[PDB]
Design a binder for this molecule. Structure first.
Ligand SMILES: *[C@H](O)[C@H](C[C@@H]1CCNC1=O)NC(=O)[C@H](CC(C)C)NC(=O)OCc1ccccc1
Ligand SMILES: *[C@H](O)[C@H](C[C@@H]1CCNC1=O)NC(=O)[C@H](CC(C)C)NC(=O)OCc1ccccc1
Lengths: 305, 305
């Protein structure tokens, strides 16, 4: 009963968050073993962030110019390197709280939990989808940079995101933990924008399933459709073209509800062409695309860690 | 930038979650010092839960009939008592992870984070409002009972909720940590229902402020109103009557936006009488009442712990 946007528990990552200061610039860092990971723009003055030469800017920096603080304890920096748009600081101490972990580049459409941090302290936790245009719709204020997104598979933390910037639209962009941006973004204060965002069709269908399961069904019709004719309608609404692989992935939900995917696709086409007429689904007056098929299964199968 | 429903970080509470088995019934418990707290219906067979005599049912139970497990470690139960609808098990070990904590009965309209647990393992974290009818709209499956809701004030965990039941509507009911239900609910499988829910007006206004701040303003009109005439309209829409105290509480937001509360009330009346015409606010096609004025300030003032 109930379907909520749910974040993973944040304890494991909470113990990996530190504060990194370089001059006047303070942001957050991720401490795993004897390496702290942070956005490289920590080394920029306010002037620099219009058109920085990070190679040249780091050349003038030494280990002692990096102030890293865990709680009130200061870590000694004993080496530094730049990997893409992230800085790896080698420290004298390995994090005793280092969890089992992995670094994963995540695919668009996929979800993760974000631990929003300021001054190396956890502020709060929310779940996000990597949007098709490689932006995320988060809540990040200044000081949030170096906050990370993650998944937990039983015991293993899979870090997929580190925060670097907001775009004029008020959306957010960042890197994987190897410092490669998701999307065509660069760490400079220039005119930057993301493409057209698409609705993640596979994720909307899954959310429709979650509804049936929770007892919302008004939207169910008496018709079916064909993938191709469904997508003709998808095109016009900026919904992602649905594939056979998608249909396979929804198979578990289809099975547990006894609703064929293409019957649900017919339901969806009606909502796109007819709206929800003031009616709501799982208490949303719009269609939600930020729930993965798996997110739904887990939440409707009570999976823990 | 961005406004998201945000849960507190769950690390501190994660270390207080245990599994409690009594016969065939397993649910979660909260371990603080040498006391584990759990719902008393753990002592019920499936037959018992239609009309249980908890006094009589506990009389037949001994300390050794309670299996409490932290991780894989079993705790020895050395005493038991029933306080309202919660059981306090005294154990041989005090939780070494016991955080600074408090037990608070929360007021309707107020929010908290829930750590959803199964078999004493954290599954995930979400934020909830205590609704005026003293229900919550959560995601709880069987095994979730003994999961708790909490706030964190810097260092102090303020536990306000423990989960016991779902109602036919698919909403949820539970107790404070002294075992007193919120609302007129009882722990039996009987026909039970909550009253009419009201929209938490103060919280909707705050969310409107959060929007302005994030750049959504279409809804702003060229008029004002009076508390009394606003509420005449509130009445009809099952919105909570707004008070002067409410207006005082929104004062900080009013000030930072330069929008008087009563001008915003005029905006609100138009949306109630005219709808949002397919338009959205902070990407919601409806009005959100599950954000406290404070929740907004914190999220728009980047407060941590
Ligand atoms: C790092 O914490 C900060 C977070 C931004 C600040 C406002 N909301 C956020 O998410 N990011 C930056 O300062 C970033 C630094 C560049 C050198 C990558 N600049 C940026 O995000 O530009 C957009 C911006 C808009 C409004 C205020 C500040 C920055
Ligand atoms: C405790 O984990 C369980 C959680 C319920 C089960 C389904 N969704 C939930 O939140 N609560 C109970 O089992 C509770 C026990 C009574 C003796 C208090 N019974 C209950 O919630 O009745 C309603 C119900 C509806 C549908 C399935 C199961 C129970």
């Amino acid at each position: 009963s109930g379907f909520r946007k749910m974040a993973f528990p944040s304890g494991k990552v909470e113990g990996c968050m530190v504060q990194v200061t370089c001059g006047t610039t303070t942001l957050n860092g991720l401490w795993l073993d004897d390496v702290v990971y942070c956005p490289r723009h920590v080394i920029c003055t306010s002037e620099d962030m219009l058109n920085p030469n990070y190679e040249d800017l780091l050349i003038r920096k030494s280990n002692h110019n990096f102030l890293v603080q865990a709680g009130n304890v200061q870590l000694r920096v004993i080496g530094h390197s730049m990997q893409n748009c992230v800085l790896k600081l080698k420290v004298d101490t390995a994090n005793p709280k280092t969890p089992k972990y992995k670094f994963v580049r995540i695919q668009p459409g996929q979800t993760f939990s974000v631990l929003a941090c300021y001054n190396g302290s956890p502020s709060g936790v929310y779940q996000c989808a990597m949007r098709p245009n490689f932006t995320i719709k988060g809540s990040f204020l200044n000081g949030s940079c170096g906050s990370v997104g993650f998944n937990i598979d039983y015991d293993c933390v899979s870090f997929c995101y580190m925060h670097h910037m907001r775009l004029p639209t008020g959306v957010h962009a960042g890197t994987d933990l190897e410092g490669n941006f998701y999307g065509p973004f660069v760490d400079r204060q220039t005119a930057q924008a993301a493409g057209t965002d698409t609705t993640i069709t596979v994720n909307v269908l899954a959310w429709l399933y979650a509804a049936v399961i929770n007892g919302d069904r008004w939207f169910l019709n008496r018709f079916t459709t064909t993938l191709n004719d469904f997508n003709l309608v998808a095109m016009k609404y900026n919904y992602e073209p649905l594939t056979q692989d998608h249909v396979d992935i929804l198979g578990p939900l289809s099975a547990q509800t006894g609703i064929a995917v293409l019957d649900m696709c017919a339901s969806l086409k009606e909502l796109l062409q007819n709206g929800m007429n003031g009616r709501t689904i799982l208490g949303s007056a719009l269609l939600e695309d930020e729930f993965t098929p798996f997110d739904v299964v887990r939440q409707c199968s009570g999976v823990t860690f």
